[PDB]
Design a protein around this ligand. Structure first.
Ligand SMILES: Nc1ncnc2c1ncn2[C@@H]1O[C@H](COP(=O)(O)OP(=O)(O)OP(=O)(O)O)[C@@H](O)[C@H]1O
Ligand SMILES: [Ca+2]
Lengths: 357, 411
């Protein structure tokens, strides 16, 4: 009998379950509670006393005391499995500094008698469940948004774009404007359940020089939400206002070159000979990429900057907001590849520096 | 000389220092604590506490697919298990049924449709086929599972990923290509139609805006005018080409405060501001600046002629002799149901594209673009676009510059 878990660690939301699955049989936010340890979800309803941590900043782990906490929680709690009897797939950001791939793995083998484990790049795994095994990805969940050129599971180190705008980055510019329309959103809970506007609503037009004129020349784009307090909130030209930021870095000062713009320059960084298919294969990954209406909103802008004789298929899976995790259950349910594992054995003999080779 | 534990202990992967030279190690202190802490009790537990517990090992069932034969490049064997990743749990055979037996879960996900009709996956080489012959099949006649059955050299020795390649790209070789070009049309022809026809309207209803916009025409006329008034005898002319447009901006005024295109704009709005409608009417043209019009067509000639070919195959070859159709290949039970209406819209688009191209080439012939010159054929719109914006820009500059020429006028 046999089994294998897959854990995609992220800035904002941990996301993990088992092998050959449809998605994670568990998910929560990367958050840890310690007094002036209670991790995960029962960590909001425990604010004030325990100050709150985010073991991961922009994709990269920054607090290992806590990070360890999560991986612990993850298993024994939202999985009920207890290591040892399980090979584990962990994930890591493009360009995760060797240092941590070691500190990462160590934690496992040492702290949970994990028999085997491999550490996969976040883009890449994404593009695996899109069928392809080549061409530029746009992972872009909460903390960070990377632009990763790929090619037969092989990312191009010198042509990866890392941009520091994304999830909570946006969940933020919203709260900005909602009160600029006089609202109760400043406090905390009156924020958690407000990124939420963004998730359950919040689309993106195709152009503002043509849709900001549908409430500033109209009154049909509103909508409302039922706040835990009852008092309903009516949202206006909001759903699509913030996400504009990706394309529109500026919105929060962000002097940044934009998401679609980057997929562009990025590619122009790696060789020409692959570009056709790069363009022909824009897979996209979780969070900030799955707002309704960004799929083809991208497509537009990109096909725009891009040449007029270029194939430009711009993918966007069932729920890429699990793209990377999904691909995760694939390259492992996919058995055969099993010769990419690192047995506690191999580890015990060489140690950290082995997670690498 | 060092003391040692009875059971394996949790290793301390450290990075040793080699030369002891003038360190702190070398004075043997290390050796005192050595035995000391051993007799003094200590190590005894340090032993018990960091006892490295055993390590389980399993999987196997999918491991061993390793040991079995494989004539398929890691890449491929891999990019099967990639898209056939939903059929993971199904055995090497369960799955093939579900595929020949064109389920509604397989045909629905193009990822798999597309894959399976990938030239790189279809095309088998002699050098390749050979390797698979001792395990192939013929299905000539065969109308039941158990019939055929001449395994001869057994197929089980191959890696899972290898087997599929066999029972499908090999054993149904003869027709797999067309079988797939068909199932595809089946599954695609729908949207893959609306998609074009619309792509075609964004042309037709911009090429339209140009047809009639007495406005636009007039503006040029106003330029031809000022042109001739400026140009000299040898340079007078009853009409010019679009290639003129882009060099309006260079002609500066005296005090380089004006771009000729400014006056031209100013002039309209203040003598005929009954024409600045072209900058409204003609936007639909901008909505297609980069459209490869010479390949929009061809994509349509591709649509129809593709169907007009799953047709040819149902009758005169490939997709006729239900005999080779591995008993289960429920393609026909699935093709024909739609082959009819499909082809209808196949002849539809044709008509439409006839109706359109000819029209288009006409508007072009007008301004002087030869419907037969790759370049203008497409670089056409862009000059109208370019002009417009160069203009929508001169307009601004002028409408704003005319503001500043009010305050430094009042204050
Ligand atoms: N359903 C949704 N629709 C639109 N946006 C969402 C949705 N869910 C989350 N988001 C936004 O994207 C973020 C989550 O994305 P994801 O889970 O991929 O982040 P992540 O794991 O932190 O990835 P990374 O660490 O690279 O930032 C949320 O914090 C929010 O900003
Ligand atoms: Ca992520």
């Amino acid at each position: 009998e046999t089994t294998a878990l897959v854990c995609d660690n992220g800035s904002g939301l941990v996301k993990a379950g088992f092998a050959g699955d449809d998605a994670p049989r568990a998910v929560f936010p990367s958050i840890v509670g310690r007094p002036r340890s209670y991790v995960g979800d029962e960590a909001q309803s425990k604010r004030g006393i325990l100050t709150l941590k985010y073991p991961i900043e922009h994709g990269i782990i920054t607090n290992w005391d806590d990070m360890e906490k999560i991986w612990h929680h993850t298993f024994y709690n939202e999985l009920r499995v207890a290591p040892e009897e399980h090979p584990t797939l962990l994930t890591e950001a493009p360009l995760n500094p060797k240092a941590n791939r070691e500190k990462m793995t160590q934690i496992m083998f040492e702290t949970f008698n994990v028999p085997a484990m491999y550490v996969a790049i976040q883009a890449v795994l994404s593009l695996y469940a899109s069928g392809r095994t080549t061409g530029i990805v746009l992972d872009s969940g909460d903390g960070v948004t990377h632009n990763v050129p790929i090619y037969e599971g092989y990312a191009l180190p010198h042509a990866i774009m890392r941009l520091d705008l994304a999830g909570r980055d946006l969940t933020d510019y919203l709260m900005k404007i909602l009160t600029e329309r006089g609202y109760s959103f400043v406090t905390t809970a009156e924020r958690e359940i407000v990124r939420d506007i963004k998730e359950k609503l919040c689309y993106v037009a195709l152009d503002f020089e043509n849709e900001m004129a549908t409430a500033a020349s109209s009154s049909s784009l509103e909508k409302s939400y039922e706040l835990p307090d009852g008092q309903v909130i009516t949202i206006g030209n909001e759903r699509f206002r913030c996400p504009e930021t990706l394309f529109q870095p500026s919105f929060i000062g962000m002097e940044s070159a934009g998401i679609h713009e980057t997929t562009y320059n990025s590619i122009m960084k790696c060789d020409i000979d692959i570009r056709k298919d790069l363009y022909a294969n824009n897979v996209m990954s979780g969070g900030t990429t799955m707002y309704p209406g960004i799929a083809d909103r991208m497509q537009k802008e990109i096909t725009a900057l891009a040449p007029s004789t270029m194939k430009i298929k711009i993918i966007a899976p069932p729920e890429r907001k699990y793209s990377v995790w999904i691909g995760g259950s694939i390259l492992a349910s996919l058995s055969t590849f099993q010769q990419m594992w690192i047995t506690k054995q191999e580890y015990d003999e060489a140690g950290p520096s082995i997670v690498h080779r | 000389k060092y003391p040692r534990p009875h059971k394996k202990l949790k290793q301390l992967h450290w990075e040793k220092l080699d030369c002891t030279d003038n360190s702190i190690w070398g004075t043997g202190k290390a050796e005192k604590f050595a035995d000391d802490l051993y007799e003094k009790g200590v190590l005894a537990d340090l032993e018990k506490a960091f006892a490295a517990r055993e390590i389980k090992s399993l999987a196997s069932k999918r491991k061993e697919d390793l040991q079995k034969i494989t004539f398929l490049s890691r890449d491929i064997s891999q990019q099967f298990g990639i898209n056939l990743h939903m059929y993971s749990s199904l055995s090497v055979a369960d799955l093939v049924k579900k595929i020949l037996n064109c389920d509604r879960d397989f045909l629905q996900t193009p990822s798999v449709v597309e894959f399976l009709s990938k030239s790189e996956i279809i095309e088998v080489s002699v050098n390749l086929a050979r390797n698979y012959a001792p395990y192939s099949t013929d299905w000539e006649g065969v109308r039941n599972l158990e019939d055929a059955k001449p395994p001869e050299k057994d197929p089980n020795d191959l890696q899972r990923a290898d087997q599929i390649y066999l029972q499908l790209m090999v054993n149904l070789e003869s027709y797999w290509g067309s079988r797939m070009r068909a199932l595809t049309v089946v599954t695609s022809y729908e949207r893959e139609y609306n998609e074009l026809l619309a792509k075609l309207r964004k042309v037709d209803k911009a090429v339209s805006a140009l047809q009639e916009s007495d406005n636009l025409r007039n503006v040029f006329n106003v330029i031809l005018a000022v042109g001739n008034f400026m140009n000299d005898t040898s340079k007078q002319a009853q009409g010019f080409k679009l290639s003129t447009l882009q060099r309006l901006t260079f002609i500066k005024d005296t005090t380089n405060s004006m771009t000729f295109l400014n006056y031209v704009e100013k002039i309209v709005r203040l003598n005929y501001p009954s024409f600045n409608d072209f900058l409204s009417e003609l936007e639909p043209v901008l909505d297609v600046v980069k459209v490869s019009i010479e390949q929009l067509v061809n994509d349509c000639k591709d649509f129809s002629q593709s169907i007009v070919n799953v047709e040819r195959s149902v009758e005169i070859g490939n997709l006729s002799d239900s005999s080779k159709f591995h008993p289960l290949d429920k393609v026909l039970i699935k093709t024909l149901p739609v082959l009819p209406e499909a082809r209808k819209k196949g002849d539809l688009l044709e008509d439409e594209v006839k109706l359109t191209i000819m029209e288009f080439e006409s508007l072009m012939h007008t301004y002087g673009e030869d419907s037969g010159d790759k370049f203008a054929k497409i670089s056409f719109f862009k000059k109208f676009a370019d002009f417009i914006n160069e203009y929508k820009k001169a307009q601004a500059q002028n409408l704003a510059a005319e503001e500043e020429e009010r305050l430094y006028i009042k204050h």
